[PDB]
């Protein structure tokens, strides 16, 4: 298996825009691009070129928001639940496997720039949170909260 | 098994060889040329077949009477036998009377 | 040999007065009212008129449409139609494309 | 019953008859259809090239 | 001096003659040297596509002779005797070893002898065929009329580049009136060109016209074609073959 | 036949309808030819419908290739990663349009 970028009938620009439009989200396209470019990729790219910004900021913001957002939802829905309980429940929702499942079927991996194909789940998860972070900068807390609800809560 | 296991050599057909280019020229020899010749005078081939058409039986009758003398002993015996066969087939056999 | 010329044609703004000039040349200075009604039954004058228009405008009436040029109005109405000449790739590429659509060309 | 035999005699005769003309009309109107030039020339479109 | 041409043969009252531009082969920019009137009956009749097919199919098939034959059971060598008795063995019963059923046998119903596929469409139909083909050429801007097939030089590349300049297309059919009085320059040029073809008037047919993208005619040939094709209607039925003398034919 | 073939249980991708409906068709790849009758039907599909179709569903990215081929085809790709190939071949604009709709509203 080789990445879909390395396959006929591919233009990343048009695909990026369609990723925005699929989810009915008015993304800032510049930021979304920045969300999909991993640090591992840039190291490999530099080494390859020998013979651009990281996801870091966007990814951290995405994860921190989703954690707080998910706790808010869960505390409001299930008030009798303890703190430790909802901790584990959010941790499940922000889990490697489940978030990567969502990522896989939202074609996140298709637009993800990584050194290794198929994509390691750590990277894919990091990329998915970058998407959320970019969306957060794009359309404020409200729209993003709706996105979390529509994707993560459904799991 | 009985199906080829590779593609045959590609066939290229030259559509613009002289024979293809001047195909069917002088078919209008009659109407365009004062009726000096019929187009049937462009037909080449057997003596018994130039500008005439018939079923197998009729073709055989005709070949017998036109080149019957000049043909080979065994060929002619084959032709006499053909005619005998076809005569019975057409006159005595079939669905409709 | 001269280079092959484009089949593209845009009708000019002063077509009316240019045709005025050409008709008054060929049919003579004296011109009756409603000059659009002038018949091109005469073979020689038809040729002369159409030649002048063909040489300057660059666009010629084809063999197919020649018998349709019965009257002078018919010539005027013929030259006001534009011809734009480009391959179908070129016409589609600049045809208000949605950004999701992509067309490529392997000829 | 409702009407006696005498009552019903010829009560529906008009409707019966005028229905039969409808049959005859349809029977007497079968004919070859119209031949249009539009479809004949449309067979040229089979070679219609992009360029 | 403009080159003008009128129709000599009488036209019907309701019909009007069509025009064609007249050009010469002498120059690249020598289009529009004259104007010509063409007889509407030859050059502007009804597009009859069925007729084109009819004539074309007759043209392809009427000359054809088939050379394929196969030997029948009677014609195959040997096969006289009965291979084994009917009753005795377990074997399936046979009369000869050369029967269709057997390997090496004769053919049951095969290609039989030289076969001719000759037939004649009626004359008037073939005539109408030529007419349709000519209208269709002029309708689609595929027909050109020339004063003469005279070339400035016999260099065959001149003729190709002229067709390119005049948007004639890949294949051009050149028709002259007589074979003998064809110009030297055109014969030299066309001899070594595959796609461009020179024929005399009498040669002209439906098949070549359809095969070639362009039809080019001379003014001599256009008057000639009109004469003969228009002769076809407005003639009686024959009493005897037209090769024989009449009081007004040739 | 049921025994002779595989089975699945009814599902959707990622509980599609639950929050918001997401169109599953992601990519469309049309292979047409400039010349040749097979691609004729498809040719005029690219004349008219492609443009407005692409506007109608911004989620789908449409690629049109335009290279010589004896059989024109369309490659439907989905979010989950299935690939569906369909040979449009000698089909009228209308029945090609029906195909492209049928692809776009399925998972
Ligand atoms: Mg024997
Ligand atoms: Mg026996
Ligand atoms: Mg026996
Ligand atoms: Mg044998």
The domain that holds E234 is classified in CATH as 3.40.1370.10
DSSP assignment of B13-72, as one string?
--TTSHHHHTTTTTTTHHHHTTTSS-GGGS--S-TTTTT----HHHHHHHHHHHHTTTS-
Domain extent at residue A100: 5-155
User: Does C contact D via 3+ CB–CB distances below 8 Å?
Assistant: yes
Q: Which residues pair with E18 in a beta bridge?
A: E38
Elucidated via? cryo-EM
Q: What whole-number distance in Å separates Cα of residue E186 and Cα of residue E158?
A: 11
C-alpha atoms less than 13 angstroms from C-alpha of B50 in its C-beta half-sphere: 11
Q: Which residues of C touch E19 (CB under 8 A)?
A: 43, 46, 63, 66-67
Interface of C with E (CB under 8 A): 1-2, 4, 7, 43-44, 46-48, 50-51, 54-55, 60, 62-64, 66-67
Cα–Cα distances in Å, from B25 out to B49, E82, E124, E179, E208?
21, 56, 19, 13, 7
Q: What whole-number distance in Å separates Cα of residue C46 and Cα of residue B84?
A: 75
Which domains are present in chain F?
A: 1-107 (3.40.30.10)
Q: What whole-number distance in Å separates Cα of residue E198 and Cα of residue E187?
A: 8
Please answer yes or no on whether E194 and B35 come within 8 Å at the CB atom. Answer: no
What is the tally of structural domains in chain A?
1
Beta strands at E143-146 and E196-200: parallel, antiparallel or unpaired: unpaired
CB of E219 closer than 8 Å to CB of E5: yes
What is the tally of structural domains in chain E?
1
Local structure of residue F20 (DSSP, 8 states) = S
CA-based torsion, A23, A24, A25, A29: positive or negative: positive
Q: Smallest Cα–Cα separation from E19: which of E34, E2, E36?
A: E36
| Cβ within 8 Å of residue A17, ≥6 positions away | A29, C99, C100, F58
Q: Judging by beta carbons within 10 Å of its beta carbon (0-12, 13-18, 19+), is residue E60 exposed, middle or buried?
A: middle
Q: Smallest Cα–Cα separation from E196: which of E231, E170, E222?
A: E170
What is the CB neighbour count within 10 angstroms for residue E126? 24
Q: Where are the domains of chain B?
A: 1-96
The backbone region for A140, taken as left when phi is positive above 0, alpha when psi lies in -120 to 50, beta otherwise, is left
Q: What whole-number distance in Å separates Cα of residue C51 and Cα of residue C59?
A: 10
Q: How many CB pairs under 8 A join C and E?
A: 53
Structure tokens at C92: 């589609």
Q: Which residues of D touch E49 (CB under 8 A)?
A: 40-41, 43-44
| Cβ within 8 Å of residue A15, ≥6 positions away | A110, A111, F61
Q: Give the number of residues written for chain D.
A: 51
CB of B38 closer than 8 Å to CB of B30: yes
Of E118, E202, E250, the CB nearest to B29: E202
Of F34, F46, F60, the CB nearest to C100: F60
Domain extent at residue E131: 1-250
Q: Which residues pair with F25 in a beta bridge?
A: F78
Structure tokens at D3: 């009407």
């Amino acid at each position: 298996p080789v990445r879909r970028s390395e396959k006929p009938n591919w233009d990343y620009h048009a695909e990026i825009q369609a990723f925005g439009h699929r989810l009915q989200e008015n993304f800032s396209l510049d930021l979304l691009k920045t969300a999909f470019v991993n640090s591992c990729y840039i190291k490999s790219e530099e080494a390859k070129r020998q013979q651009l910004k990281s996801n870091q900021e966007l990814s951290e913001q995405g994860t921190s928001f989703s954690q707080t957002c998910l706790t808010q939802f869960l505390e409001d829905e299930y008030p009798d639940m303890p703190t430790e309980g909802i901790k584990n429940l959010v941790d499940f929702l922000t889990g490697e496997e489940v978030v990567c499942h969502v990522a896989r079927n939202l074609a996140v991996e298709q637009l993800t720039l990584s050194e290794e194909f198929p994509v390691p789940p750590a990277v894919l998860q990091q990329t998915f949170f970058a998407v959320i972070g970019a969306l957060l900068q794009s359309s404020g807390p409200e729209r993003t909260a709706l996105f979390i609800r529509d994707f993560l809560i459904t799991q | 098994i009985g199906i080829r296991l590779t593609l045959p050599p590609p066939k290229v057909v030259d559509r613009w060889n002289e024979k293809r280019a001047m195909f069917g020229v002088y078919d209008n020899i009659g109407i365009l040329g004062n009726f000096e010749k019929h187009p049937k005078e462009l037909i080449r081939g057997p003596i018994w077949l130039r500008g005439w058409k018939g079923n197998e039986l009729q073709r055989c009758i005709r070949k017998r009477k036109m080149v019957g003398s000049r043909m080979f002993a065994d060929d002619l015996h084959n032709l006499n036998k053909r005619i005998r066969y076809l005569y019975k087939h057409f006159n005595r056999h079939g669905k409709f009377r | 040999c001269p280079p092959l010329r484009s089949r593209a044609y845009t009708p000019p703004e002063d077509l009316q007065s240019r045709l005025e000039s050409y008709v008054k040349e060929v049919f003579g200075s004296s011109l009756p009212s409603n000059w659009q009604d002038i018949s091109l039954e005469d073979s020689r004058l038809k040729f002369n008129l159409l030649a002048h228009l063909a040489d300057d405008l660059g666009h010629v009436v084809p063999n197919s449409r020649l018998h349709q040029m019965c009257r002078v109005r018919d010539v005027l109405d013929f030259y006001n139609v534009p011809i734009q000449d480009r391959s179908k790739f070129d016409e589609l590429s600049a045809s208000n494309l949605p950004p999701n659509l992509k067309i490529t060309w392997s000829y | 019953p409702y009407m006696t035999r005498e009552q019903e005699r010829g009560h529906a005769a008009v409707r019966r008859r005028e229905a039969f003309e409808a049959i005859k009309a349809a029977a007497t109107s079968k004919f070859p259809p119209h031949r249009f030039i539009a479809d004949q020339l449309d067979h040229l479109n089979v070679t219609k090239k992009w360029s | 001096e403009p080159v003008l041409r009128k129709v000599e043969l009488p036209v019907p009252t309701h019909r009007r003659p069509v025009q064609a531009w007249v050009e010469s082969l002498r120059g690249f920019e020598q289009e529009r040297v004259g104007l010509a009137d063409l007889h509407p009956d030859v050059f502007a009749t009804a597009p009859r596509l069925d007729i084109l097919h009819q004539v074309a199919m007759w043209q392809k098939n009427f000359k054809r002779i088939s050379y394929a034959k196969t030997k029948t059971r009677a014609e195959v060598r040997g096969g006289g005797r009965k291979p084994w008795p009917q009753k005795g063995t377990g074997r399936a019963r046979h009369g000869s070893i050369r029967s269709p059923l057997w390997r090496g046998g004769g053919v049951a119903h095969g290609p039989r002898g030289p076969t001719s596929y000759y037939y004649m469409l009626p004359m008037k139909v073939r005539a109408l065929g030529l007419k349709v083909a000519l209208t269709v050429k002029l309708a689609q801007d595929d027909l050109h009329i020339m004063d003469s097939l005279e070339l400035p030089t016999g260099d065959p590349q001149y003729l190709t580049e002229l067709a390119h300049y005049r948007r004639w297309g890949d294949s051009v059919l050149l028709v002259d009136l007589t074979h003998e009085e064809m110009p030297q320059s055109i014969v030299e040029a066309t001899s070594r060109l595959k796609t461009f073809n020179l024929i005399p008037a009498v040669g002209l047919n439906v098949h070549s016209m359809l095969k070639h993208q362009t039809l080019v005619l001379t003014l001599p040939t256009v008057a000639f074609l009109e004469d003969k094709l228009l002769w076809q209607d407005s003639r009686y039925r024959p009493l005897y073959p037209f090769s024989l003398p009449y009081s007004d034919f040739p | 036949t049921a025994r002779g073939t595989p089975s699945r249980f009814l599902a959707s991708v990622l509980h599609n309808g639950l929050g918001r409906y997401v169109q599953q068709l992601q990519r469309l790849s049309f292979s047409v030819s400039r010349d040749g009758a097979s691609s004729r039907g498809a040719r005029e599909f690219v004349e008219r419908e492609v443009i407005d179709f692409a506007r109608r569903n911004p989620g789908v990215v449409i690629y049109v290739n335009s290279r010589p081929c004896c059989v024109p085809r369309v490659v439907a790709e989905y979010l989950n990663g299935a690939v569906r190939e369909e040979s449009i071949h000698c089909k009228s604009v209308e029945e090609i349009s029906t195909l492209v709709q049928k692809l776009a509203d399925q998972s």
